[PDB]
Amino acid sequence: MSAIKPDMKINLRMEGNVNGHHFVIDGDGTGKPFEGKQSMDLEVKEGGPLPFAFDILTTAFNRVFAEYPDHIQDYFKQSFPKGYSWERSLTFEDGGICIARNDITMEGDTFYNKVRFHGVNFPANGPVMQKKTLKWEPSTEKMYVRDGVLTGDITMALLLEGNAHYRCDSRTTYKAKEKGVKLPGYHLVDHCIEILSHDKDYNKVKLYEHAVAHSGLPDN
Amino acid sequence: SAIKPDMKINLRMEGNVNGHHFVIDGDGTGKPFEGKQSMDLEVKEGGPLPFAFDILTTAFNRVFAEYPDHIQDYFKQSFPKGYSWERSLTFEDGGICIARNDITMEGDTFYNKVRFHGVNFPANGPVMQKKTLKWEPSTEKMYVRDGVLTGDITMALLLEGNAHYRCDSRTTYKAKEKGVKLPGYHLVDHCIEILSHDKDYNKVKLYEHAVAHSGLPDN
Amino acid sequence: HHMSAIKPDMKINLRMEGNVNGHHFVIDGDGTGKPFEGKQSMDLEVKEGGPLPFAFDILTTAFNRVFAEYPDHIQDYFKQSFPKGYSWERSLTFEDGGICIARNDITMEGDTFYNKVRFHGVNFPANGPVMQKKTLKWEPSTEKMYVRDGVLTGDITMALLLEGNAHYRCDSRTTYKAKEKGVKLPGYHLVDHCIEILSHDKDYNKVKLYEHAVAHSGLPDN
Amino acid sequence: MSAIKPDMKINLRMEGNVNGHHFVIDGDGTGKPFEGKQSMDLEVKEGGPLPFAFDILTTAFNRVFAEYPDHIQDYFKQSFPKGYSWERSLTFEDGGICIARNDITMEGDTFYNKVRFHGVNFPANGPVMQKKTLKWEPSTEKMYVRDGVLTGDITMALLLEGNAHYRCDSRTTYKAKEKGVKLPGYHLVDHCIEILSHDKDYNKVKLYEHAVAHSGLPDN
Numbered sequence: 001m002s003a004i005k006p007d008m009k010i011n012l013r014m015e016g017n018v019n020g021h022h023f024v025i026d027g028d029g030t031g032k033p034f035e036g037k038q039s040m041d042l043e044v045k046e047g048g049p050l051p052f053a054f055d056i057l058t059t060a061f062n063r064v065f066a067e068y069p070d071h072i073q074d075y076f077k078q079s080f081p082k083g084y085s086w087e088r089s090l091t092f093e094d095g096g097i098c099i100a101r102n103d104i105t106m107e108g109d110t111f112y113n114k115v116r117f118h119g120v121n122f123p124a125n126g127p128v129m130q131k132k133t134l135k136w137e138p139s140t141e142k143m144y145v146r147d148g149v150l151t152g153d154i155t156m157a158l159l160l161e162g163n164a165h166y167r168c169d170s171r172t173t174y175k176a177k178e179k180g181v182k183l184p185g186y187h188l189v190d191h192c193i194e195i196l197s198h199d200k201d202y203n204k205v206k207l208y209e210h211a212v213a214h215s216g217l218p219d220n
Numbered sequence: 221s222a223i224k225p226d227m228k229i230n231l232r233m234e235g236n237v238n239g240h241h242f243v244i245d246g247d248g249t250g251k252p253f254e255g256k257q258s259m260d261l262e263v264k265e266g267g268p269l270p271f272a273f274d275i276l277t278t279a280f281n282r283v284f285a286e287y288p289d290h291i292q293d294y295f296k297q298s299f300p301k302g303y304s305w306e307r308s309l310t311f312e313d314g315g316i317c318i319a320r321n322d323i324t325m326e327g328d329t330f331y332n333k334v335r336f337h338g339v340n341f342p343a344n345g346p347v348m349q350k351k352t353l354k355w356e357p358s359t360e361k362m363y364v365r366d367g368v369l370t371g372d373i374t375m376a377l378l379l380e381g382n383a384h385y386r387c388d389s390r391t392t393y394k395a396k397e398k399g400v401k402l403p404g405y406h407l408v409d410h411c412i413e414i415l416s417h418d419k420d421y422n423k424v425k426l427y428e429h430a431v432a433h434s435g436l437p438d439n
Numbered sequence: 440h441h442m443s444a445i446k447p448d449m450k451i452n453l454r455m456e457g458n459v460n461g462h463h464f465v466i467d468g469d470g471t472g473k474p475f476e477g478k479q480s481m482d483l484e485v486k487e488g489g490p491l492p493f494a495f496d497i498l499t500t501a502f503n504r505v506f507a508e509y510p511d512h513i514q515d516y517f518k519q520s521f522p523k524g525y526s527w528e529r530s531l532t533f534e535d536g537g538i539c540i541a542r543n544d545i546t547m548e549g550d551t552f553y554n555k556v557r558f559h560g561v562n563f564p565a566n567g568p569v570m571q572k573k574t575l576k577w578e579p580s581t582e583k584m585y586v587r588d589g590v591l592t593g594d595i596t597m598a599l600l601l602e603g604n605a606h607y608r609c610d611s612r613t614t615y616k617a618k619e620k621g622v623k624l625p626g627y628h629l630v631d632h633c634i635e636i637l638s639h640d641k642d643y644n645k646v647k648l649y650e651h652a653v654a655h656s657g658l659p660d661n
Numbered sequence: 662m663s664a665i666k667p668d669m670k671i672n673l674r675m676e677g678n679v680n681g682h683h684f685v686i687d688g689d690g691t692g693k694p695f696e697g698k699q700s701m702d703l704e705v706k707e708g709g710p711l712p713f714a715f716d717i718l719t720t721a722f723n724r725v726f727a728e729y730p731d732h733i734q735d736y737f738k739q740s741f742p743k744g745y746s747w748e749r750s751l752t753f754e755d756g757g758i759c760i761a762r763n764d765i766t767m768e769g770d771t772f773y774n775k776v777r778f779h780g781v782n783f784p785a786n787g788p789v790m791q792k793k794t795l796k797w798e799p800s801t802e803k804m805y806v807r808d809g810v811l812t813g814d815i816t817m818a819l820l821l822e823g824n825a826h827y828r829c830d831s832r833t834t835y836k837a838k839e840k841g842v843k844l845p846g847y848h849l850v851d852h853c854i855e856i857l858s859h860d861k862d863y864n865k866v867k868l869y870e871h872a873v874a875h876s877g878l879p880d881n
């Protein structure tokens with residue numbers, strides 16, 4: 001009833017502004033929604049080289065690519081073909097704050113992603129502006145309903161040079177476009193996002209993501 | 221030098237709160253040295269706004285604050301070239317807004333390019349339900365962090381029914397010209413009010429009064 | 440690096456003294472567990488301050504990461520911290536302003552872990568779910584373990600299930616410190632947790648608690 | 662007739678534990694409730710010399726001593742002779758968290774303060790454990806009612822050696838012991854606290870505080 005196919009293309013356009021620097025990044029990728037895997041090639045079309053760590057944008061670069069077991073309601077796959085949208089806040093431990101949105105629509109075998117990303121108050125000597133990030137660590141999103149809306153909260157951490165970490169708290173709210181899509185119960189979503197390759201200045205990046213929903217111990 | 225006793229304000233805000241895009245124009249006047257400014261606002265697009273207009277109002281210029289002679293006035297020292305600010309508002313129910321302003325001057329007019337984005341406001345909360353009455357008067361705590369003037373504020377919106385809605389504000393302020401000397405720690409008292417509005421806030425008259433001081437016992 | 444003297448089956452002796460919103464209480468615990476299976480359980484008895492005027496659940500995460508199953512590719516700080524032991528301190532920040540801090544000093548004698556627990560909580564609203572006892576249980580969660588300023592630290596996004604099927608969020612931060620020199624710090628990893636009140640009397644003066652915890656490295660290898 | 666006299670004495674005993682270090686501090690002071698001023702001599706009875714910055718304890722060492730104007734209800738002066746108590750959390754930007762409680766009663770011309778202070782999760786290399794604090798900057802408490810209880814929130818900042826600042830957010834709830842003390846409307850309370858003198862290791866400290874409530878601008 002979704003018309004979500006086992007192999008899907010992804011078409012993404014993101015425009016943003018972090019600390020006054022405007023950028024536009026295009027993505028073209030492919031994914032396996034039922035396998036919870038996606039990858040994409042990204043190109044900074046405007047505003048490169050980015051004066052800040054590319055990693056902070058990468059979670060903005062679609063929970064339709066999360067493997068859901070049968071015992072958990074899969075709000076995202078049930079949201080199609082009309083699609084859904086999300087809004088997120090990323091609160092970093094040094095006061096940097098970003099918000100992002102994405103409206104996901106599907107035409108055929110392609111998801112289209114309209115992504116906006118704005119960040120403010122990153123310290124000049126912090127690891128984001130000084131590009132000291134190495135990767136996001138694997139994380140687990142906590143998904144619950146609040147005020148009739150599916151919401152995901154995650155304790156996230158960017159690995160830095162020296163193997164220090166930089167903490168970020170994210171909150172995302174997810175909203176099906178079509179009315180009456182059934183909200184899931186509380187669950188967890190394991191995430192692992194990775195930049196597989198990049199040019200020296202991150203004007204081109206290959207990004208990979210793997211996400212699996214589960215109900216926690218003892219069952220997972 | 222740059223800043224005259226009476227001064228005009230031209231503002232354009234583009235925003236998106238909870239996915240609703242809007243554009244608001246502002247034409248105003250103030251007295252920088254008395255720390256008072258007033259502005260007429262017209263929602264040019266996205267009207268009527270589906271959310272509390274009050275959340276936008278602190279984004280609608282610290283050059284309009286009365287600084288006393290004993291405290292360095294970074295804002296007036298930033299002109300003619302001007303300065304910019306970036307702000308996050310973290311509301312107690314998870315709603316978060318970020319805003320930027322780039323302020324420039326030509327002649328007797330300040331030009332404000334304002335952007336405002338808000339996400340994650342709950343549908344039955346006072347913001348989406350428009351249950352706000354006003355920002356309470358507040359005090360900004362101004363300090364330097366990582367070489368940047370920063371202002372933090374414990375803010376509270378009065379709601380219908382006499383409850384309050386808490387927000388924490390952090391603003392960073394940056395002069396465009398290199399070498400503007402940063403102030404030491406100080407406070408800025410703020411009072412913002414909507415003086416009038418039409419029923420759906422497509423037109424609003426806004427007024428703000430701000431005074432910088434060094435706290436007790438000398439304030 | 441050395442023999443821990445941690446046996447596959449251990450006893451637990453716990454004494455907690457605390458104050459939440461001005462109400463003092465003392466709670467004693469006797470339990471047993473399997474450190475290598477990451478499972479433990481204990482019978483708790485409120486020794487005074489009973490019956491508690493707040494939700495018992497907020498105390499439960501304070502009632503030992505030595506009971507967590509670690510795979511051998513993740514360094515297990517807690518088991519190596521024995522025989523001498525370790526201590527932790529923790530803050531719980533609840534979404535409505537309630538804030539708790541808690542400390543445990545853990546030692547081992549023979550086949551028994553001894554836990555000296557303190558718990559202090561302030562600013563919970565009178566009509567909030569903690570003070571009105573509207574909580575059902577903690578949801579399963581995942582702690583993110585990492586080294587922060589040279590100290591092993593775990594941060595958790597937690598949520599209490601309430602009556603009416605709402606959730607009440609809490610953020611926890613715990614610092615863990617071995618008592619002896621030479622304990623190797625682990626790299627970033629995750630710890631799945633699930634805690635549950637198995638049974639209780641009407642006023643929670645008596646409670647049976649169980650916990651299961653498993654360490655892992657996240658996707659793709661978990 | 663009034664329980665609040667123009668010249669009052671203060672008797673205080675604090676017991677605390679910060680980062681596992683236990684301590685007991687006794688305080689003997691005087692103040693002028695109507696002028697919003699008080700001072701106290703403190704002596705560390707147990708656990709001295711303290712291994713952390715004494716300044717973090719100082720706001721725990723009574724809003725009875727705040728000058729309130731006629732047009733703002735003075736909850737604190739109206740709470741006596743029976744008294745009131747407060748509970749507070751101090752959330753420092755580097756993860757240190759302190760909670761404190763004070764139960765204040767009165768006998769004759771003396772206030773009795775039973776204070777408890779606990780802190781956890783201060784980093785070894787941070788300004789509290791390294792004793793790099795110089796003072797609390799002057800601040801303004803925002804006072805409002807929430808769920809029937811008078812609550813005060815403050816954006817606070819410790820000046821550090823080197824002219825940096827260390828941020829702390831505090832929230833305090835205040836509750837009269839008598840039923841029927843009328844809650845105030847929203848208002849502000851300016852505070853300044855200062856250590857007037859101390860011995861090298863802070864085993865003896867003289868502390869002073871001045872507080873004035875007001876309605877904000879325009880008025881004052």
Ligand SMILES: O=S([O-])[O-]
Binds near residue numbers: 218632633635650652
């Ligand atoms: O993991 S549960 O069964 O406590």
